[PDB]
Design a protein around this ligand. Structure first.
Ligand SMILES: [Zn+2]
Ligand SMILES: [Zn+2]
Ligand SMILES: [Zn+2]
Ligand SMILES: [Zn+2]
Lengths: 157, 149
């Protein structure tokens, strides 16, 4: 979506929850499960696939529940509906962003930026290693604009 | 460049370093300086711009040296050349990759994969904050094939 900040670092999962809280959308345990499922998914599952995979942990989950949750995620801009030719089945893919800190090596001042790239790292990590990716903590380092304008320091951090 | 592994984590800089070593290409101080510059650049500079930017902190840098080292990087597939006219101005695009570790949460066994994305993070980090990005250490975590189900 549009470039913005929540004034703190948030991974993909925590970002979704923050956005949903901002909109006063209730965060059920089922909703958390579906978000995490979609984030971890290394394919583009149908509604039925999501339903079948989460069914054991959630006996009270129905296909309607999955549709309801996907509707929220698609509208709030964290999941896209994809199509394959000749197939009428809708497939879903998580592409939601995250927010990453950049820390000044000299003064320690922190800024944050919106990232959509680490999820692509997660996909490549899975494909090339076979690992089911759990987390990719990322922190950037650099020189803040104010420190760029000053002379070279005698010490860092 | 095809997917491959060096059996160790390597950032963009160290990766370029490992690649030329593998092919017995000499590593000089000028070569290092130009590789580092190209990796950290957020634009596509001309040879003259590379020269002018590097000279104050590398006084022995010359335009000829810039062309020489760029040719090595272009031939080795790390830099692509862009032309938009017929004068002697060419622009240079660093197309690197790096290798990132994935660590198993359960057993701790490490694998690595080829990444072309963290350099794009660095670009976005600069554009959104104004910081001159110096480094972005990255390690992935997951469950290795053996520890799964
Ligand atoms: Zn956000
Ligand atoms: Zn600073
Ligand atoms: Zn390599
Ligand atoms: Zn393991």
């Amino acid at each position: 979506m549009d470039i913005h900040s929540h004034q703190q670092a948030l991974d993909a999962y925590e970002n979704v929850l923050e956005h949903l809280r901002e909109k006063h959308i209730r965060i059920t345990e089922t909703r958390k499960a579906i978000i995490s499922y979609m984030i971890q998914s290394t394919e583009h599952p149908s509604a039925d696939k999501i339903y079948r995979d989460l069914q054991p942990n959630f006996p009270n989950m129905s296909l309607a529940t999955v549709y309801n949750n996907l509707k929220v995620l698609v509208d709030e801009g964290f999941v896209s509906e994809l199509k394959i030719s000749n197939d009428l089945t809708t497939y879903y893919d998580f592409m939601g962003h995250q927010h990453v800190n950049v820390v000044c090596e000299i003064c320690g001042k922190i800024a944050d930026f919106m990232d959509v790239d680490v999820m692509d790292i997660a996909k490549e990590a899975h494909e090339q290693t076979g690992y089911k990716v759990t987390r990719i903590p990322v922190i950037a380092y650099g020189i803040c604009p104010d420190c760029q304008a000053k002379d070279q320091p005698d010490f860092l951090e």
